[PDB]
Design an enzyme around this catalytic site. Structure first.
Site, PDB file in Angstrom:
ATOM      1  N   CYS A 146     -79.167   5.265 -17.547  1.00 53.36           N
ATOM      2  CA  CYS A 146     -80.070   5.761 -16.540  1.00 53.36           C
ATOM      3  C   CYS A 146     -79.531   5.483 -15.162  1.00 53.36           C
ATOM      4  O   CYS A 146     -79.128   4.402 -14.888  1.00 53.36           O
ATOM      5  CB  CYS A 146     -81.390   5.102 -16.701  1.00 53.36           C
ATOM      6  SG  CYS A 146     -82.410   5.958 -17.852  1.00 53.36           S
ATOM      7  N   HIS A 160     -88.322   4.253 -12.519  1.00 50.61           N
ATOM      8  CA  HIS A 160     -88.800   3.450 -13.635  1.00 50.61           C
ATOM      9  C   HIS A 160     -88.011   2.153 -13.808  1.00 50.61           C
ATOM     10  O   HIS A 160     -88.251   1.430 -14.782  1.00 50.61           O
ATOM     11  CB  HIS A 160     -88.847   4.258 -14.954  1.00 50.61           C
ATOM     12  CG  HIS A 160     -87.515   4.695 -15.500  1.00 50.61           C
ATOM     13  ND1 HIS A 160     -86.575   3.812 -15.994  1.00 50.61           N
ATOM     14  CD2 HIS A 160     -87.009   5.934 -15.710  1.00 50.61           C
ATOM     15  CE1 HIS A 160     -85.526   4.488 -16.434  1.00 50.61           C
ATOM     16  NE2 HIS A 160     -85.767   5.779 -16.278  1.00 50.61           N
ATOM     17  N   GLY A 203     -79.246   2.309 -20.917  1.00 50.86           N
ATOM     18  CA  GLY A 203     -78.412   1.724 -19.889  1.00 50.86           C
ATOM     19  C   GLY A 203     -77.718   2.737 -19.010  1.00 50.86           C
ATOM     20  O   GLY A 203     -77.278   2.381 -17.906  1.00 50.86           O
TER      21      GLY A 203
HETATM   22  C1  LIG Z   1     -82.184   4.736 -19.151  1.00 51.43           C
HETATM   23  O1  LIG Z   1     -81.176   5.253 -19.499  1.00 51.43           O
HETATM   24  C2  LIG Z   1     -82.264   3.214 -19.045  1.00 51.43           C
HETATM   25  N1  LIG Z   1     -81.326   2.547 -18.401  1.00 51.43           N
HETATM   26  C3  LIG Z   1     -81.351   1.234 -18.283  1.00 51.43           C
HETATM   27  C4  LIG Z   1     -82.383   0.498 -18.842  1.00 51.43           C
HETATM   28 BR1  LIG Z   1     -82.412  -1.434 -18.665  1.00 51.43          BR
HETATM   29  C5  LIG Z   1     -83.396   1.152 -19.531  1.00 51.43           C
HETATM   30  C6  LIG Z   1     -83.323   2.534 -19.627  1.00 51.43           C
HETATM   31  O2  LIG Z   1     -84.319   3.242 -20.310  1.00 51.43           O
HETATM   32  C7  LIG Z   1     -85.622   2.898 -19.929  1.00 51.43           C
HETATM   33  C8  LIG Z   1     -86.460   4.174 -19.878  1.00 51.43           C
HETATM   34  C9  LIG Z   1     -87.612   4.216 -19.107  1.00 51.43           C
HETATM   35  C10 LIG Z   1     -88.372   5.372 -19.061  1.00 51.43           C
HETATM   36  C11 LIG Z   1     -87.981   6.487 -19.784  1.00 51.43           C
HETATM   37 CL1  LIG Z   1     -88.960   7.978 -19.724  1.00 51.43          CL
HETATM   38  C12 LIG Z   1     -86.829   6.446 -20.554  1.00 51.43           C
HETATM   39 BR2  LIG Z   1     -86.281   8.008 -21.566  1.00 51.43          BR
HETATM   40  C13 LIG Z   1     -86.070   5.289 -20.600  1.00 51.43           C
END
Ligand SMILES: *C(=O)c1ncc(Br)cc1OCc1ccc(Cl)c(Br)c1
Ligand SMILES: *C(=O)c1ncc(Br)cc1OCc1ccc(Cl)c(Br)c1
Lengths: 296, 299
Positions: free
Chosen positions: A142, A41, A140
């Site tokens: 992720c 994603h 962040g």
């Molecule tokens: C997730 O921790 C993350 N990290 C960096 C960025 Br920039 C955006 C994040 O969250 C986006 C996100 C997309 C899809 C899902 Cl299912 C989730 Br929960 C969070």
């Protein structure tokens, strides 16, 4: 002596964290040999119902900005394996540890190196029976990974999302989600969780090993009837053989410990290892590792 | 989302860990630049050791310093307070930026537990008000260090001993925290709860959605402190109150209001309810620890 929630030393994973950038969205990635692994994603823009195949087609290597500390790395190929994106870079990571990718089972534990912008923020030590983890993850984070160490690092978890309920879900390093979750920002239901029974037993042993014995004083089938009322995972013979070494070192038979736990669920203001609830995030292996001080 | 006891990433400290052996004794050492630091009881064959007269009988080559597989050559040895300092002929190529700091009761740090110069695990700890630490140290762990990270590693603690079952040790200049000495013989103080940390942890709980403990009262620094004394809690000071400012403003709850909530938890207990997954009041998070985690401070 003493007993703490202990994470593995994190250095071998630190040297594998990178920053992955696609459009505005940036998150953490895992650089191993000439491949960077990150959540797919990262290619998501308002896109609730992403058609990832469609979305990745609109994307070219050029749109993938991978930063390894200061230095940028050249993306020379890209692919999607289930829910992870594999970015082939032209430089192999020189800090690459010996590693394997592993899919763990509910109730097993691992260390999370929480990361933002490719940089480590902290490390802490269970996959719940319902395949969530009760972690500490901010937007962040992720791409942060969970791992065990054996000089070889077994990566088992890549963080993908924060659920509305405040718990967290993710994938193994082949991109298969743990649990029923999908990488869409929609309401998604996690199972009824349960307490990990064999871990609580393991922690009762760690308690006896450290001098806390007040809870000492049933049968496997009698036990599972009481544990099912209190929302405890049923205890199997496999779980009992797993607890064998701890029984041997303590001299307290496995079904004796189970009798102690029965009385504990039926009756309850004293502490065990300085906690006032029963802990279920220590596996029998975790207890042995810490109580005999396994090094790496 | 969520809130864990979180240690610092340990890699910078991992590259400084070595094994130090002297006769029948092996423990861990800290190798920064061309110096290895380790507990001085490495030279004890205890009960009542005369450390100066045991050091006399020792020469450089009696000290085996091992860094991974490499043997380092010891060209100097001295004793500063309770740490031994071993000059070696090769600077540690992996020395991070570092300082030595003495921390204050109730401040937190990460411990990289080590055996035979190799790491076993990392966990977050707090210096108790009686200057002990409730750690996890088996035989052989001596020499493991506690640290905080800022890209600079500030070393605050070196493990020395298990009391008859908490833990005691020194800063990196070899001054013990608390009244302890390096002999096998010692009473620790009375261990109070670290109030400013419990307050910060209530702030963390509020930030994470757990608000059930928030009451309808306020109180005064003096009124609160009277209750703190009764429940073996650390006196709260204006400095503590000023340290709680950011958390008070972020959550919009006056420190003295949070103090009144905590007073009710101390007097009425918790009634089987939990706060951030704990059924006790937690005091091993500093206001800084809460802020770093809730905002995602990196290193
Ligand atoms: C997730 O921790 C993350 N990290 C960096 C960025 Br920039 C955006 C994040 O969250 C986006 C996100 C997309 C899809 C899902 Cl299912 C989730 Br929960 C969070
Ligand atoms: C302590 O960690 C340690 N590690 C390895 C070896 Br060999 C011996 C150790 O301690 C023995 C010891 C000396 C002095 C005190 Cl005051 C204590 Br507790 C333990």
């Amino acid at each position: 002596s003493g007993f703490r929630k202990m994470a593995f030393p994190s250095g071998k994973v630190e040297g594998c964290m990178v920053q992955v950038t696609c459009g505005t969205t940036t998150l953490n990635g895992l650089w191993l040999d000439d491949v960077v692994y990150c959540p797919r994603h990262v290619i998501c823009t308002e896109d609730l119902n992403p058609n990832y195949e469609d979305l990745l087609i609109r994307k070219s290597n050029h749109n993938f900005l991978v930063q390894a500390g200061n230095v940028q790395l050249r993306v020379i190929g890209h692919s999607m394996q289930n829910c992870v994106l594999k970015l082939k870079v032209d430089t192999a990571n020189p800090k690459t540890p010996k590693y394997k990718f592993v899919r763990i089972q509910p109730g097993q534990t691992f260390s999370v190196l929480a990361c933002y912008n490719g940089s480590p923020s902290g490390v802490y030590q269970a996959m719940r029976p319902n395949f969530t983890i009760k972690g500490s993850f901010l937007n962040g984070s992720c791409g942060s990974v969970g791992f065990n160490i054996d000089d070889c690092v077994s990566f088992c978890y890549m963080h993908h999302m924060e659920l509305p309920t405040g718990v967290h879900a993710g994938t193994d390093l082949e991109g298969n989600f743990y649990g029923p979750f999908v990488d869409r920002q929609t309401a998604q239901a996690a199972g009824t969780d349960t307490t990990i029974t064999v871990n609580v037993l393991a922690w009762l042993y760690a308690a006896v090993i450290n001098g806390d014995r007040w809870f000492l004083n049933t049968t496997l089938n009698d036990f599972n009837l009481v544990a099912m009322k209190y929302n405890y995972e049923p205890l199997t013979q496999d779980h009992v053989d797993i607890l064998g070494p701890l029984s041997a070192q303590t001299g307290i038979a496995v079904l004796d410990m189970c009798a102690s736990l029965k009385e504990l669920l039926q009756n309850g203001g004293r502490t065990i290892l300085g906690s006032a609830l029963l802990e279920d995030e220590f596996t029998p292996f975790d207890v042995v590792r810490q109580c005999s001080g396994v090094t790496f």
